[PDB]
Every structure is written in structure tokens, then in C-alpha cells.
């Protein structure tokens, strides 16, 4: 979305990534509605260990 803002018929794909702190695995309700997706990911971003 940070590419196009002048045309309302271009379509886009926005990826907001939340990095789980440890190697833990929150299931779905410990993340969605509770955690905040502030970091932005895109095509090329290298992810953690």
C-alpha cells in the first residue's frame, strides 16, 4: 500500500509481522486480538532463527 495511494483500483498486499519473542508457539488467541502487528514485512525480509 505504501507504493500506490493515488488510484483506488490498483490492489495491494500488506504484511504486518509479529515476532514471537522466544521459541514459544502461541496458538491463535494469544496473538490475534492480543498482540500488535507493528513491524512491517515485505518480499525479501530475512526472518529469525
Curated annotation (Swiss-Prot):
Subcellular location: Cytoplasm; Vacuole
Family as reported in the entry's similarity comment: Belongs to the glycosyl hydrolase 38 family.
Task of the protein: Degrades free oligosaccharides in the vacuole.
Protein name: Alpha-mannosidase
Organism: Schizosaccharomyces pombe (strain 972 / ATCC 24843) (Fission yeast)
Gene expressing this chain: ams1
